[PDB]
Every structure is written in C-alpha cells, then in structure tokens.
Scaffold this active site. Structure first.
Site, short mmCIF file in Angstrom:
data_model
loop_
_atom_site.label_atom_id
_atom_site.label_comp_id
_atom_site.label_asym_id
_atom_site.label_seq_id
_atom_site.Cartn_x
_atom_site.Cartn_y
_atom_site.Cartn_z
N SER A 1 104.04 45.09 -30.83
CA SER A 1 103.84 44.12 -31.79
C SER A 1 104.20 42.81 -30.96
O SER A 1 103.81 41.69 -31.26
CB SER A 1 104.55 43.76 -33.23
OG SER A 1 104.27 44.91 -33.86
N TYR B 1 102.26 20.57 -55.93
CA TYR B 1 101.87 19.57 -56.62
C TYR B 1 102.95 18.33 -56.99
O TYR B 1 102.63 17.20 -56.69
CB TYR B 1 101.27 19.83 -58.10
CG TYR B 1 100.07 20.63 -58.30
CD1 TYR B 1 98.98 20.18 -57.83
CD2 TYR B 1 99.81 21.98 -58.87
CE1 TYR B 1 97.61 20.84 -57.93
CE2 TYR B 1 99.00 22.55 -59.04
CZ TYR B 1 97.50 21.98 -58.61
OH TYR B 1 96.51 22.87 -58.71
N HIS C 1 91.01 57.29 -35.12
CA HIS C 1 92.22 57.11 -34.16
C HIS C 1 92.37 55.96 -33.64
O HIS C 1 91.15 55.47 -33.30
CB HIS C 1 92.04 58.27 -33.34
CG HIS C 1 92.29 59.89 -34.01
ND1 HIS C 1 92.65 60.81 -33.04
CD2 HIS C 1 92.08 60.26 -35.21
CE1 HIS C 1 92.70 62.04 -33.94
NE2 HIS C 1 92.53 61.50 -35.25
N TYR D 1 90.89 21.34 -63.54
CA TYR D 1 91.51 20.12 -63.40
C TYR D 1 90.74 19.14 -62.33
O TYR D 1 89.92 19.53 -61.69
CB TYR D 1 92.84 20.34 -62.76
CG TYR D 1 93.00 21.18 -61.50
CD1 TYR D 1 93.21 22.62 -61.72
CD2 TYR D 1 93.21 20.88 -60.29
CE1 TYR D 1 93.31 23.42 -60.62
CE2 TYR D 1 93.31 21.55 -59.09
CZ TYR D 1 93.62 23.00 -59.33
OH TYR D 1 93.64 23.85 -58.20
N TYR E 1 86.16 59.00 -40.04
CA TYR E 1 85.72 60.32 -39.95
C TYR E 1 85.83 61.27 -41.24
O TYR E 1 86.14 60.56 -42.27
CB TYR E 1 85.96 61.06 -38.74
CG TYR E 1 87.54 61.39 -38.58
CD1 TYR E 1 88.37 60.46 -37.98
CD2 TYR E 1 88.32 62.46 -39.17
CE1 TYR E 1 89.60 60.43 -37.73
CE2 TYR E 1 89.34 62.89 -38.95
CZ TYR E 1 90.19 61.62 -38.40
OH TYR E 1 91.52 61.66 -38.25
N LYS F 1 107.74 49.50 -35.07
CA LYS F 1 107.06 48.48 -35.23
C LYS F 1 105.85 48.20 -34.27
O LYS F 1 105.59 47.29 -33.50
CB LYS F 1 107.69 46.97 -35.12
CG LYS F 1 109.18 47.09 -35.53
CD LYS F 1 109.77 45.73 -35.84
CE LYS F 1 108.70 45.05 -36.91
NZ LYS F 1 109.47 44.14 -37.61
N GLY G 1 95.36 19.41 -52.94
CA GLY G 1 95.89 19.08 -51.65
C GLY G 1 95.16 19.43 -50.27
O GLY G 1 95.40 18.72 -49.30
N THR H 1 95.44 71.58 -37.85
CA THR H 1 95.53 70.87 -36.69
C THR H 1 96.89 70.31 -36.27
O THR H 1 97.21 70.36 -35.06
CB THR H 1 94.46 69.55 -36.74
OG1 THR H 1 94.97 68.45 -37.56
CG2 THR H 1 93.08 70.02 -37.13
FE LIG Z 1 92.42 62.96 -36.74
FE LIG Z 2 95.45 23.63 -57.53
#
Ligand SMILES: [Fe+3]
Ligand SMILES: [Fe+3]
Ligand SMILES: *[C@@H]1O[C@H](CO)[C@@H](O[C@@H]2O[C@H](CO)[C@@H](O[C@@H]3O[C@H](CO[C@H]4O[C@H](CO[C@H]5O[C@H](CO)[C@@H](O)[C@H](O)[C@@H]5O)[C@@H](O)[C@H](O[C@H]5O[C@H](CO)[C@@H](O)[C@H](O)[C@@H]5O)[C@@H]4O)[C@@H](O)[C@H](O)[C@@H]3O)[C@H](O)[C@H]2NC(C)=O)[C@H](O)[C@H]1NC(C)=O
Ligand SMILES: *[C@@H]1O[C@H](CO)[C@@H](O[C@@H]2O[C@H](CO)[C@@H](O[C@@H]3O[C@H](CO)[C@@H](O)[C@H](O)[C@@H]3O)[C@H](O)[C@H]2NC(C)=O)[C@H](O)[C@H]1NC(C)=O
Ligand SMILES: *[C@@H]1O[C@H](CO)[C@@H](O)[C@H](O)[C@H]1NC(C)=O
Length: 685
Positions: A255, A522, A249, A429, A88, A69, A462, A113
């Site tokens: 995270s 609503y 890269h 509406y 690239y 993560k 709203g 590579t």
């Molecule tokens: Fe690369």
């Molecule tokens: Fe709406």
C-alpha cells in the site's frame, strides 16, 4: 527491479525462465524469491523482502488486513478474446451417473483446491453450512466439515488434526496434503485429477477446469454439474449451473512503496510479448502437465490494472465479503448483524452523538466512524456500515457507487399541518451567498480575488452551485485560482482553498471535512464570514437566520444582528436576508439517508421506528434523547429537521437529485478527477 514471490520449485523454475526471457525487452528486471506458501509471500511482501505475488480472493482478503496491508494492483482477466471477464464461477463437478445431488453430499468423498480458496473452499462451504450441523461452540468449521464428508483432499489443512480431509490426497508422506504444487491434488486441476482418478465423488473447482483437462467432448461427456436447486447439468451450462460468481485473482503489492508502477510496467510488456498466443518460446499463461497455473492462471488473457482507491475489500466486494465473514461468525452473530443498523459517523462529535443514540436505542443502532464522508461511503460499500444522512453533492458520489436514497430530511413547511411530516413532500433549501453589509461594492461580479468560505468541497450549497456557476462564467476550470484564499474543507491543505481553515482549538486537522474543523459545514462557513476570515460564505438561507438575532446562543453568533448581512444576487445586486426567495443561487434538494439496495428497506423500517422514539414528537424526546438536536451543530442530521420523510417508488440518485443538478455536477466534475469516483467506476464494471 521487481521481486516476484514464488511458492514452489516448479513456480520458481518458471519465474527464472521468465526472468531471463525478460532481459532483452529492457526493464524492469525480475527477481524470483522462493517461499513455501501464500501467507509466506504475503509476509515477504509486507516485510519488503518481495514485491509481488498473485492471490486467489481468500488470500486477497487476508493480505489486505493488518499487519500486511496489501492491495491488489492488477487483476487477471479470463474469458475469451472477444468476450473477456474479470470474474469466474465456482462449480461442483461430478462424474456422470451418480445418484447424489447437492443435498446428498454427506458421507461422500470430495476434492478441494485449497483451504480458504474461492472456488475450492469459501464458495462451497457457504452453501453446505445448513447441512453441516455445525455447533460453533464445540468445534471450528473444519471440525464440522470433517465429520460431514467421509474422506477428502483439501490441501493446506491440518493433516494431524483432520486426517480424513487429507485422506484422499495423492501426496508423498510429510508433503502429502501440502499447500502447494507438492501435493498433486492441489489447485483446480489437481482437484479435477482427484475426481478423474476416482478418489473423490466431487471436486469443487472453477468453470473452465474440465475444459482445460479433457480437450475432446467424449471424455467431457462423462462429467456433470451439481446445481443449487439440487438438480444436475452438463459442463457447458456453467453460467446456469454454478454456485457463485467469484472475483478474479489479483496481483498484490504494498500500500505504501509497493512498486506498483514497475509492477504494471513489467506486467504490461510481458503480456504484450509473451501473452496468450504471443510467442513460441515462452508462455506466461501456460504451465507444465502435472503443475498447472504457475505464477498466474492458465489461459488467462491478461491483466486489468486496478485504480488506487480500490482496496482488497472493495475489489472483493460486499457480496463475497459477506459470505467470507459470515463463515467466521456464528449464526446468531450473523442474525444480529442483519438486524442491527450500523450508522456511519463523520468525525469525533458525530461519533459521540451516535454512541448516545446507540445506548438509547438499546443497541438497535450501532456506530462506525470515518474522518470524512467519503470514507463513510466506502464503509457502506464494504458493508462495515449500513447508512448515513448526506448532502446532495455527496449523494451523487454515493449513487455513482451504487447507494440508493431511503429517506429525506423534511423540516417545517409554510403550508401543511395536516399531512404528516413523513408523508409530506420535501421543499428543498435555498442556496445563498452571504456577505457583511459593511463591505459595500461587493457584488457577484466583484468576486474574484476575495476570500471565500465554503461548507466543504462537493457539497451542494458550499461547493457545487457557486463553483459550478463560476467555472461556467469564467469559462475555466481553475477554481483553485479564483478566490485569493478560501476555506473549503476537503481540498489540499497545502493549497489556497484550505488557506483560511482553522483546524480545532489547538489548530490541528486544518481543512478536515468534519465538525472538528472550526469552519466546516453550514455553521462553520457562516462563522468564517462572521469572524471576517473570508469575504463571502456560500451556505443556505436557514443558516443566516439560525445564527443571528438571538437564535444561536453560541458566543460567536450571539451578538449578530441580521441587518449586518446581505445576499448577493446573480443580477449583480445585493439584497437583505429577508428576500432570499428573489435572491438565491439555486434550490438544493434536501439531505437524505443513503444505503445499499439490499439494506434500504430494513434501514427505512428501523429509522421510522427510531424517529417515533427520539424525533421532534418523539416519546423519549426531549427527556431521554432527541435525534435532531445537536446544539446547532447539525450532527448526523440538520438541527432544523422536523422528520425524515418517505420518498416515492424506486428512486435512484438521479431521480432524487434531478437531471439538471446531476448534469450540473457532471460538467463541474470534468475539471477535476476523484480517485473514489474512479474506483466506483471500476466497481460498476
Ligand atoms: Fe480462485
Ligand atoms: Fe446541503
Ligand atoms: C429562511 O430560513 C428561515 C429559517 O429557517 C425561515 O424562517 C423560518 O420560517 C418558518 C416557517 O416558514 C418558521 O416556522 C414558524 O415558526 C413558528 C414559531 O416560531 C417562533 O419560535 C421559533 C422557535 O423558537 C424557539 O427556538 C429557538 C431556536 O431553537 C430559540 O432561539 C427560541 O428562543 C425558542 O426557544 C423561532 O425560531 C421563531 O423566531 C423567528 O421569528 C421571530 C418573530 O416571529 C423573530 O423575532 C426571530 O428572530 C426569528 O426570526 C419564533 O419565535 C411556528 O409557530 C409556525 O407555525 C412556523 O412553524 C420559523 O420560525 C422561521 N425561523 C426563523 C429563525 O425565522 C425562512 O422561511 C426561510 N426563507 C425562505 C425564503 O425560505
Ligand atoms: C454550466 O454550463 C453547462 C454547459 O452549458 C450547463 O449544462 C447544460 O445544462 C442544461 C440544462 O441543465 C442542458 O440543457 C438541457 O438539455 C436537454 C437535452 O438536450 C433538454 O431537454 C433540456 O431542456 C435542456 O435544454 C445542457 O445540455 C447542458 N450542457 C452540457 C454541455 O451538458 C450547466 O448546467 C451549467 N452549470 C450550472 C451550475 O448551471
Ligand atoms: C429495538 O427494536 C425492537 C424491534 O423493533 C423494538 O421492540 C425495541 O423497542 C427497539 N428499541 C429501541 C429503543 O429502539
């Protein structure tokens, strides 16, 4: 202190060289963690043993997954000083004077590579796949590739299992064909060295690889580029003779607790002190002969800081994400994926309706679920979902991320019966402000410090219309401090805009923007007013009508006389619910289905087909399934929807919503910043 992960001794030696070089510039400190390959660093960062590492797009993808993560916090910028770029080009370099073209690569020897690298693997293998004759059941992609070319050097490959793919590798035994600097033919420059030493007939590297290795044009005149049309071209014509444009890269971190602030701090000052053309002693984007691109790419100009909402999938983008994921699937899986439409469901109840639709559609429609509408937009952007029907204020958000309108909701009009609903124009509406009649003295003027009920934040009726109007009239941007307490699902739960939100029947997930929040939408915002939790409800005209006078069978709305409510007008007067036409806030555009540009036509075609089976005059409605019925819940589409109408030719989000509303949204949006809006900004670079 930032722990940088290095995958080799030459890379470790540079880090250590960078570590000492930093000290005198004052914070942060850099530590050099030693590992052997990219995934080990990925695992090291995830396990909190390291903090940063720079990966190629294929690794960026894998690092974002579970259980790592990890997210890209900064990207390398390439290009020139006056003409930078943050992507690239993957290209195929051949030596001048060869008779083969791109189609004629079977039985050739190639240079790569790395396994799972953008320019070196992912990009070229998505092109060669028709020529591969891959029968996915017998062997993997590596097995089909092995018998395609003769000899080759693709480092990181199972040397014992596919020896021909490691046969051209210049490494010393039991380190030969290794996934690092150990193999001399590893990397972009190592791939070029494989071609240059005449080992392979072609090398798959980036667009600047031949320029960094042959300074004079004379040596660069002995090479060429295999174009996609099965031609050939000179090396400076890469922008027309490449295979694909790949995202640059990126440096990755965690995270959660990623040290992204320190990481950026360190990266900003390093690039400012020992960047491209910055010092004599140390070059950050400069590495040794025979061991290029250590830590970062060589001759990179610098780092572009990535927005917090952009993840590894978002950074990579749906185009690269498709090609990568399509290599992981079979032809038939890929075929089926394009044919199927994946609908995005917001919340639990919507998911149940979608699953019913899916089974009834015979898996023609597939579901995906997110807890919010914004999350669903993100999934559409990722390609994980295909579409969803949205309220106009969400459409603005989606259009700013590049999604386009496909079909709009069209209900019963007052005029036509003639023109088919599909070909009939949407009317729009009416946005209203409803109160109880019994609270006299409640005008539009006496609205401050009262309790409010909103359908959700960023929605037309709203949110955008009343808050946009209030901000303008107050001449302030503190809408959080306007009303005394509100229920506007989508705000901070600890803020006063969430203060009146209910949650479920256990009271959890209060202020969540989906049907599981009692006062959401609503229906819920009216319910909030009806149960006297708030003093005003900002909804549409139809809601009041549909939830009063025996229209709604729901026990909270079953005993509602429509003469117990009034409409606040913008002139300071109140009116009854029968004169909404002379007493409304604005007219809103109807809710529409959005999608990605390339999916739009398919989605449209499919939705038309589905509408005939399950719509208002659907063949399977009402005995099998009705797409527009949800027991007054407005799940997936509003319950009042007569059909989904076709729009005109080319319409953008701005064309559908309209200039005035777009500008209205725009000015309101200056009061607060959305991370998703910041992230889409960066994606539309
Ligand atoms: Fe690369
Ligand atoms: Fe709406
Ligand atoms: C503000 O919003 C209002 C609601 O959206 C809107 O009023 C709507 O206007 C349209 C056209 O402009 C009307 O459509 C017309 O409908 C008639 C047939 O209507 C009759 O049947 C419907 C459906 O009844 C069934 O379904 C409901 C709910 O699913 C059940 O409760 C019911 O038992 C049935 O099973 C019904 O909604 C209508 O009832 C309305 O009118 C009667 C009197 O006629 C009232 O007593 C009742 O309370 C309610 O107000 C009616 O019985 C059709 O033949 C026409 O061709 C046309 O399509 C909608 O009916 C009408 N809806 C409502 C709820 O009134 C306003 O126009 C809008 N205002 C503005 C300014 O835009
Ligand atoms: C809240 O106030 C802002 C600022 O006044 C409102 O934005 C303003 O909206 C109007 C009309 O939507 C814009 O005027 C238009 O300008 C164009 C080009 O000059 C002209 O061709 C049109 O005829 C019209 O005059 C105005 O530029 C715009 N102002 C700014 C600063 O952007 C906003 O609409 C108000 N919010 C709500 C909900 O009404
Ligand atoms: C699914 O789509 C196919 C092709 O258009 C169609 O023949 C089939 O009837 C559809 N099924 C449903 C239930 O939509």
């Amino acid at each position: 202190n930032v722990r940088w992960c290095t995958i080799s001794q030459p890379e470790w030696f540079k880090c250590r060289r960078w570590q000492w070089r930093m000290k005198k510039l004052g914070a942060p400190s850099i530590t050099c963690v030693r590992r052997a390959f990219a995934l080990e660093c990925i695992r090291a960062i995830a396990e909190k043993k390291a903090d940063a590492v720079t990966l190629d797009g294929g690794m960026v993808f894998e690092a974002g997954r579970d259980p790592y993560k990890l997210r890209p916090v900064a990207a390398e910028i390439y290009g020139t000083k006056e003409s930078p770029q943050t992507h690239y080009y993957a290209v195929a370099v051949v030596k001048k004077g060869s008779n083969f073209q791109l189609d004629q690569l079977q039985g050739r020897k190639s240079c790569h590579t790395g396994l799972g690298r953008s320019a070196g693997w992912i990009i070229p293998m998505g092109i060669l796949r028709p020529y591969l004759s891959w029968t996915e059941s017998l062997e993997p992609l590596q097995g089909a590739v092995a018998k395609f070319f003769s000899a080759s050097c693709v480092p990181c490959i199972d040397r014992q299992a596919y020896p021909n793919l490691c046969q051209l590798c210049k490494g010393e035994g039991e380190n030969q064909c290794a996934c690092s600097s150990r193999e001399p033919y590893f990397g972009y420059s190592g791939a070029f060295k494989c071609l240059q030493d005449g080992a392979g007939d072609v090398a798959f590297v980036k667009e600047t690889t031949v320029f960094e290795n042959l300074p004079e044009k004379a040596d660069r005149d002995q090479y060429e580029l295999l174009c996609l049309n099965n031609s050939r071209a000179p090396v400076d014509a890469f922008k027309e003779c490449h295979l694909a444009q790949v995202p640059s890269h990126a440096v990755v971190a965690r995270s959660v607790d990623g040290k992204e602030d320190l990481i950026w701090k360190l990266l900003s000052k390093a690039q400012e002190k020992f960047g491209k053309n910055k010092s004599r002693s140390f070059q950050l984007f400069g590495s040794p002969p025979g061991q290029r691109d250590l830590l970062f790419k060589d001759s990179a100009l610098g780092f572009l800081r990535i927005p917090s909402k952009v993840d590894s999938a978002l950074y990579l983008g749906s185009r690269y994400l498709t090609t990568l994921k399509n290599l992981r699937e079979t032809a038939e899986e890929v075929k089926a994926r394009y044919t199927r439409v994946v609908w995005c469901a917001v919340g639990p109840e919507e998911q149940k309706k979608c699953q019913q639709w899916s089974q009834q559609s015979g898996q023609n429609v597939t579901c995906a679920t997110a807890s919010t509408t914004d999350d669903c937009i993100v999934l559409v952007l990722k390609g994980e979902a295909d579409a969803l029907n949205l309220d106009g204020g969400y459409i603005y958000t989606a259009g700013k991320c590049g999604l386009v309108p496909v079909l709009a909701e069209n209900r019963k009009s007052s005029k036509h019966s003639s023109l088919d609903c599909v070909l009939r124009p949407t009317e729009g509406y009416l946005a209203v402000a409803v109160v109880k009649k019994a609270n006299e003295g409640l005008t539009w003027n006496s609205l401050k410090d009262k309790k409010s009920c909103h359908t959700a934040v960023d929605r037309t009726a709203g949110w955008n219309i009343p808050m946009g109007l209030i901000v303008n009239q107050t001449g302030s941007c503190a809408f959080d401090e306007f009303f005394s307490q509100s229920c506007a699902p989508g705000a901070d739960p600890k803020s006063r805009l969430c203060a009146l939100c209910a949650g479920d029947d256990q009271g959890l997930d209060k202020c969540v923007p989906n049907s599981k929040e009692k006062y959401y939408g609503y229906t819920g915002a009216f319910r909030c007013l009806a149960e006297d939790v708030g003093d005003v409800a900002f909804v549409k005209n139809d809601t009041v009508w549909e939830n009063t006078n025996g229209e709604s069978t729901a026990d909270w709305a079953k005993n509602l006389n429509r003469e117990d409510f009034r409409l606040l007008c913008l002139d300071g007067t109140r009116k009854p619910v029968t004169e909404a036409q002379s007493c409304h806030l604005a007219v809103a555009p109807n809710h529409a289905v959005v999608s990605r540009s390339d999916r739009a036509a398919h989605v449209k075609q499919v939705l038309l087909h589905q509408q005939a089976l399950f719509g208002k005059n659907g063949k399977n409605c009402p005995d099998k399934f009705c797409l527009f019925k949800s027991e007054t819940k407005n799940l997936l589409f509003n319950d009042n929807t007569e059909c989904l109408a076709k729009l005109g030719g080319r319409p953008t989000y701005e064309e559908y919503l309209g200039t005035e509303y777009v500008t209205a949204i725009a000015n309101l949006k200056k009061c607060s910043t959305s991370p998703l809006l910041e992230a889409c900004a960066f994606l539309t670079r």
